[PDB]
Symmetry: C3
Subunit: 385 residues, 3 copies
């Protein structure tokens, strides 16, 4: 199956992070250490994503890859190059200080360019063209996902996808080519305004937004559908849908199996936070893959697949606090091998699609999820109220 | 004096961890990083030791040495090689999925062997023969230890040692040579099924169990003897004895001084835990040794000895939580130089053998232990009740 | 402007840490890792600074630079070379075990020298001479600092400076040359007892104490002046003055800008601690500088300055606990881009000199500090009571 590019996932997550429910525009930020996600941040009303990551990580930002949905300002860029980040990837549409409003906006962008010149860190654009079948593969698997088939069992998806397309190009894309060229002049991307580089960048950006709208619509705000019980209190539906699209994006990094499963872990601290996500903070993410260092990565072969929940718990940037409410979002029903790990790790809530619940396959089982105690299970369904 | 090897200590601690008081058999696990113990785990009713270590450490298992009392199954092995462990050492008697019950047990064992082929991590048997005088040295020093002499001052030890030999041979050894050969073939140890390698492995296994039964009997469940006050509530006697044997095993890594002292630090979390040890979790361990990076390691020379308690507090894998109940188990009375460190570190309880309490020797003193306030002191003695 | 060197700052901070308000003399200790301060410790009634740092850091002392205000004893030195420190710097005066009282004191010093010979770590005197204009620059800028100018608005400073010179010379310097030679004879500094090395060491020692007495007097205990509101409860005035002199010393590491700003972050844990500072523990420190790894460090150029508060929050050795009271001490009023960072980081209290509060300069503003909510602001002023 086609696999989402590893830097394209980080670019897509930063765009999705900007859409996290809550002159200067909101920015999503993905912090990546050792090519593993260690931070998912969004701008707040008071602080920018780059300044939030400095508070959250500080000197731990050393040798980290930062993926911005908007080019960071001079104040943000100086603080992260001071922290020691190596790569700063940004989505080249409109920076933090909007250029579509200003003399100050151009001045700040000009100061960013000369800060980049006099610095070791690399401020660049790391979005890649997708595989020829990648968009169609995501579009087909978004029909077949748990959350869309659940609604079907009880045409709508295509309508929902089209509205997300119009909304997301309105936010992440500059429709007017002349405005985009002026932005690329201002943010030091002069090499990308000459064809075919201008058209290639614009088509690559539109392809990534089309894929993002496809994935976001696969967990849609359709009717009263949401995550309900089937602490014990559920997350807000807008937040729960957002974290499931995160896990769904992670599910497209799977290439070792025919079906991609994605998992993301989020926790809610019992205190005020500076992040735009609020008390919500990222814990860990993972997808279905083979063990790192194994020959499979380079009886059925599925037995050695590391599941999405296992990878999320393995490469976690934060510890699970017993006092805090922690959530794991799995694109499928957690299996008989993953449920004990989730309960053992202390995760309070499970948000998953229970299409395969109670099923016993040849090499995987989903029997322990139905009879799970001590962990709140929220599944995609109509509101019981 | 004869010194226990590091791998032999780690192998013995994994066997001892399986005996931690609480088709698939229980497994003890020792996690070692940079030749320092960072985790002492045992299998629980719900999770295996390998799965527990993934929850406890996760990506921190990278380049960690894992010592299993039983060969881990395919689910455990794939997760730890995915985590990044380099060397997996197991006791070659009976794996997690018991082969003495099965087609599934053999099938899982065969799947483990081709993970070892298709992976970077090393699944080996780091078991070594003991020194010629090591067993006799341990047996002699077990007479002279504080806990045996405390009972003597108030023939029994040899009887206690003999029962542990029968019990531990029945648990960690395959007495029948034919079943042991079948296990070794099934777990990919065909090179150890031919003499003299078969006899050498079995004799070395029996030597390690005989030493383990000697050490375990030195802190015996004899009469009403235990650790009593002489938070503030004591540990369960079975747990306290187990942690003292851990420290006693660490005491045999000492070679810089004629007398070996061992210390281990354990704490109780105020929440549910997935480990087979329950809320108990390992904090740090150490023994009497010279400073690392000194000519002594490679004015009396004892004043340069780093004591067991100091080494335990130095190379601690966990921080001491003020809200938690933390315990240190010292094979002897803590000295006037270690008691301030234990109190300063915030350790709530001290379990020790106070044979030398109130004594002023040349390079060591034991006056501050008797007059210590703010720390609970539990010593080996008869129950005052 | 003249700039204080790193080793001289660490040496001066260790001497200042000895003066932290609360046979064997009190010792201040600075723990430095990767040229960043990760620990500010002082001796307590029960424990020494070297033993406290072992409790505070343990194995994290590996490859750490330890700066002592007095030469550590044999017990302290063995534990820190065992922990793995790569360099021990001490103030070449009366050591931890005072030699001005003793056969035991001389015996311990001989044991320290023998341990140093048979060990990898370097026990040295990293004291350096100051720049020719360094003392006069500090003396001039101490007139112009916020705290001295605040009192002037509401001759006194020179009198206060002279008493600190007499007090600090009596504490950190050996006035008699004969006793100082005997100390240097005993502590293995035989090469510093011959002129001009003896006179160079003594003159450099007196120069550092004169600079320290100049910085300390710039935040003096003059009349009722202190830090008052203008949790919510203020620190003790002696503690607050001490931490601001720490930040003021950090302000003299600034050379990128004509005016030096320093910031230090301290937190108070809600539990007993072994340190001589009590529940107070060091969090982070910083000064005004250009980003690390930038051409500026090796559109106005001040826009790229990393402020003292931003550097303190970036290179912090501890996290800001929401339940704890955390304090930041800034030598000047925090600017409009540092106040959001301080509030975002969760720092409860700000101690600063609000000379520039409410001022709007070309490239810096101080408008958000006056209208700050949720953070306690304590400024240098007379007691309102
Ligand atoms: Zn910004
Ligand atoms: Zn699974
Ligand atoms: Zn297993
Ligand atoms: Zn001791
Ligand atoms: Zn000392
Ligand atoms: Zn500032």
């Amino acid at each position: 199956i086609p696999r989402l590019s590893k830097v394209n996932l980080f670019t897509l997550l930063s765009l999705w992070m900007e859409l996290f429910p809550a002159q200067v525009k909101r920015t999503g930020l993905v912090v990546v250490k050792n090519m593993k996600i260690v931070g998912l941040h969004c701008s707040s009303e008071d602080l920018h994503a780059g300044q939030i990551a400095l508070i959250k990580h500080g000197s731990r930002l050393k040798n980290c890859d930062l993926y911005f949905s908007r080019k960071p300002c001079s104040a943000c860029l100086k603080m992260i190059v001071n922290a020691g980040v190596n790569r700063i990837s940004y989505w080249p549409a409109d920076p933090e200080i909007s250029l579509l409003t200003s003399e100050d906006a151009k001045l700040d962008a000009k100061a960013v360019e000369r800060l980049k010149s006099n610095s070791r860190a690399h401020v660049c654009v790391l979005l890649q063209p997708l595989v020829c079948y990648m968009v169609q593969f995501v579009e087909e698997t978004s029909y077949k996902c748990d959350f869309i088939q659940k609604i079907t069992k009880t045409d709508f998806y295509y309508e929902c996808k089209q509205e997300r397309i119009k909304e997301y190009e309105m936010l992440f894309l500059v429709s007017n080519e002349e405005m985009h060229k002026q932005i690329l002049m201002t943010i030091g991307l002069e090499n990308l305004c000459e064809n075919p580089y201008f058209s290639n960048l614009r088509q690559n950006m539109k392809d990534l937004i089309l894929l993002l709208a496809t994935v976001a619509s696969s967990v849609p705000n359709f009717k009263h559908f949401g995550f309900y019980r089937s602490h014990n209190q559920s997350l807000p539906q807008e937040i729960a849908r957002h974290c499931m699209v995160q896990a769904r994006l992670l599910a497209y990094r799977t290439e070792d199996h025919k079906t991609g499963v994605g998992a993301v872990i989020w926790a809610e601290g019992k205190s005020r936070s500076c992040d735009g996500t609020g008390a919500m903070y990222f814990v860990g993410c993972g997808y279905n893959a083979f063990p790192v260092g194994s020959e499979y990565a380079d009886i059925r072969k599925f037995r050695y697949i590391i599941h999405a929940a296992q990878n999320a718990l393995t490469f976690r940037c934060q510890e699970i606090k017993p006092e805090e409410r922690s959530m794991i979002f799995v694109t499928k029903c957690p299996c008989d091998e993953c449920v004990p790990l989730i309960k053992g790790a202390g995760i309070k809530q499970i948000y998953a699609g229970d299409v395969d619940v109670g099923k016993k396959k040849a090499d995987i089982s989903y029997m322990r999820f139905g009879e799970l105690e001590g962990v709140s299970k929220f599944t995609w369904q109509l509101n019981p109220s």
